[PDB]
Design a protein around this nucleic acid. Structure first.
Ligand SMILES: [Zn+2]
Ligand SMILES: [Zn+2]
Ligand SMILES: [Zn+2]
Ligand SMILES: [Zn+2]
Lengths: 184, 184, 184, 184, 184, 184, 184, 184
DNA sequence: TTTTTTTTTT
DNA sequence: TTTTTTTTTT
């Protein structure tokens, strides 16, 4: 960890936007970096993060990524532009913590695509999610478009084409509508 | 270790006999024993073995079966009918590590059925994979008939039809001829 | 430098206004001048500029045009009508490096038409790209009409129809709105 | 150099198997590495090599790759399995030189796919090509299958699907037949 | 006649608002009544009507509803809230046959929602379909909202989600404008 | 009747080769004629036949078609070449009766494709089916190929592409194998 | 004649919307009828008409169809709804003559799709084309959509998919724009 | 009649050896003669024959060649090497009409190569097509090699490569076996 | 995939 | 793409 590829099921079992469908007690994060040292080349970085369960360093993926990014990368005076493809979305208290990283780290920009939502009625979630988009970080909901790109590059697809499910395009509409309301 | 079966999704993945199958950082060993103490009912011994990548004993799944069958089982003066179903062909130091085993334990007869072959161009694999079928064992490629077997006895198929995958017979044949070239 | 035109294949590539357009490690600047010494025929000045990544002068294509137009051309007391067609939006230190130029050389009027925008989230780009159209210049996104122009005057099209590409108008619009957001 | 992606035309202008069609005075090589340190992880390496023209270090791609592989990589006691997708095939005297690298470097295995052939009547070519397959290195001719995989991974495709030409499947047949005769 | 509901498969078929929809040799009429005798509980009356093509009474589904509502129901001095859901727009001799009905039975208020329009170019349809909404009725095209209604109250949906079909809203809109052109 | 098109479900509910899957108490026949009057043009004829249930003229489709073909068509001295796409195959005693029509009617040739089989152990069926192929009439089993052509031309498809099911390609294999044995 | 299918080339040589591209001295018409006898079934009729060159009965397809429709069909009191897919459009004096047929024949409605235009500057053409749409007959320009349906049903396609050309989608735009101006 | 060659588009159409090839209401006969008067230079005679469907002589292309070769050519006491290339297999009354010809004109040797077979189930075709190759002629199916020949000698290919079509060899083989079954 | 394309249709 | 599928057809 961080591993660079989800096994075909790990993707389906944890990336299906099935709201009231109980079956996800963890969260996965897929990303793509973008290093830009003012007057120097531009390199890429991609991978996958899972929630930890060992003695220490719990982190719900979102956090686990911030750790990896701080003491490992985070180059002085250089810019960054990361993209996320989270599954069990920034948790009620995570979304807020992430929005405060982009705070004391202006050299980094972020774009977040998510499959589900830790409920759209929870206060903490409305807080951290609204405050996240206030710090300049576009938060959208994975549609058929995003699930394809996410399956083709972060899954040991064995060269198999993405196969959509019943409800995808719907739950997108419903998840997007209920987000565009909280993200007003 | 020794667990009794593999979940459905786990099987179809680590057992797909592909050439480009990238993502299998572990080999799986399945088996059916057949104990004949001569003066009792013919008993058996099923099971499955995931490999190892932890602190103690970094056994390549094949190495862990010998340790389990050496002291827990193996009754002096009793013929054994062992049948494997390895996903990842026997590794270099393992192909010989088993040939030396089969050598001393004459009462043990073996016949292996692999799904994929580990770098068939290499010598060290051909050395072991050769002297191995030269002992009394028999190395063979899993065809449709064999895979079917596993989906019935070594997986929690939940009473479900096999359903192969494009290029099973094709990959099978090519793998067989590439083996029969070496195995001589 | 200053070459007169781009080969067909070279144009369609470095000029495709895409969002994910990865592979453009150089910016291209096209232009049409219009010299009016007031008491003579209205002359012009065409051309194209590839950037630099060699030993001497690491000018970002935009920096090399100022050096070429500073001493070789530019006749004191003569209005200039400059029109660019940059593939890669003006870089941070260049957006301002040109605003300070346009400042002193009042007789020089400019209007830029970019194909793609260089990290619009960043501040340093918005600083320059703002004070630039605040000088007397005008930054704008290349639409279908503009691209067409180039394929006629800055490329060895060999007498051939334009033929856009999927997502030209779409990418165009989104890029325009993202610019009009900053440009204020 | 070695760069990691060919611009769309560089691919078409140099990878089209148009025998008597004069228009290729250079050669390109696309590859994929495969590091295997006995009991350690397995990393990948991909890129592109072009013929040099600078003062020294000429090399026709084939050679340029051997240089890069020697003093840079080539890890002691570790194995390697490279694959090539050459354009202007191993030159009359290169094919032979490559076959002699695989000689004093048994830890490395090779597979070569090519678009055209430096003529199939040239002695030196029959020598080096026959001697190349003698050192254990399968040399085949790119078909529609190979050109697709080669275009989708080594070309700034801008996410565009491979588009085949008139003669591809034919010249394959003719190039493969005239190779299976020399590679008897 | 009057049956209470349509099987799932039957609905999606005879109700697909298509332009080329060929194969509907029968019209279906669905309805919800709302009886208000003023001095009693507000009751209702559901139902569905298949047309006719048998020996006696060749009523076009619409003609059969009037016969059923004329003597079996219709209590003098009681307001009626009728709502139809015809698949096939009211036929020529039917559009007027209903306008003359609505005329005399003033206590009857109606509002129709059709799925498809029967040859809108013809006059005889426009004559009826005009004087019909000029009586107190109201002819309208079934949009997504209305179709949904039916899949809930007039079909044995077996507790299942609606799931429209490509070109529902598209065909809907075009049909609406083609109606609003006539209906004037 | 004979109608010229099956409603989408009538096709699925009656053309699915689900052996022990009880749910087909009737039979449907889809066909294509071919008139050839020695030295005259060549016209076509297509349609669909369902089993009758009225007072008289029962016939299980197979028969209903022979009736229609006798007193209606069957032109003297002219040839015919019909093709069938039957669902609930020639019944134990029908297959035989059909084989005896081709007897006293040599001017007619036949080709039969079927979805299921009225069991392959029934004597009468082995009789009539073996005797049917003896009279020159190729009897095969609908595969994915046949179901597509059969769905695209004999079903009010509303311009929708054929959508295959779970078991199709399998039951074909099993039905074809068990037929090639009886049709020895 | 009227034949019911164009040979693959006859379609390409005469249905390509290549304005100034000289190579069409004749005209072809593809159609689909629609009989509707008030309270009777609804039958279809399709075919192809070519310009005559024999001694008499010249007619430029458009006319040849009116002849066939008059003394042959044209049933009293019954309605009709025809559709055209003309190639060398209603000639300057034909378009007008067609518009006057729809005059003394109100029971017939028409929809015309065309590939090219007998020039959009010719008076007679502006007359007959404007007067044609005045008599209630929608005249549009074949796009990719129309050419597909037209190729799949009126051409001996040998089961081959429609293959579009260079300029189709463009000339449509240009032909549609220059028509929406005259059809104001 | 006798014309020297077929236009490109005409060939590929009437010569496509398909099973469902519907649309060929005419047969084409190609041929190469080889006159040997024994005491002169070996001359030849090329040509092509379209069938007939006009007032006088309704010859089926094959019947018209006999009339042309009976009086215009055919010099008593001179061996003839005739080779046909019929698109449509010899018709019933023609297969025998030629067998009776070959019978009397012994000095005439023939060998036919057909593209498609006319209703091979029929008897009258087998009668002729049998006694025909029993005379000294030889009926055979056009494979890839033969078709190629025609595209070189009987068509205005305008110096262009053959380019077969999907299912040429496949249809070829099946047609050959179906012929070899009869031809016995 | 629960309702509609983004410039010149290999 | 110059002639033919490799196990259970979202
Ligand atoms: Zn720089
Ligand atoms: Zn190890
Ligand atoms: Zn005739
Ligand atoms: Zn009626």
């Amino acid at each position: 960890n961080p591993m660079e590829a989800m096994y075909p099921h790990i993707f389906y079992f944890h990336f299906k936007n099935l709201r009231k469908a109980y079956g996800r007690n963890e969260s996965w994060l897929c990303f793509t970096m973008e290093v830009v040292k003012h007057h120097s080349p531009v390199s890429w970085k991609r991978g996958v993060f899972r929630n930890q369960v060992d003695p220490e360093t719990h982190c719900h993926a979102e956090r686990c990524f911030l750790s990896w990014f701080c003491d490992d990368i985070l180059s002085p005076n250089t810019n960054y532009e990361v993209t996320w493809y989270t599954s069990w979305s920034p948790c009620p208290e995570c979304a807020g913590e992430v929005a405060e990283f982009l705070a004391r780290h202006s050299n980094v920009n972020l774009t977040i695509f998510t499959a589900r939502l830790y409920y759209f009625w929870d206060t903490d979630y409305q807080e951290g999610l609204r405050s996240l988009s206030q710090e300049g970080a576009s938060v959208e909901i994975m549609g058929y478009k995003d699930f394809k790109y996410c399956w083709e590059n972060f899954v040991y697809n064995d060269d198999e084409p993405f196969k959509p499910w019943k409800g995808l395009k719907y739950n997108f509409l419903f998840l997007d509508s209920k987000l565009q309301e909280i993200l007003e």
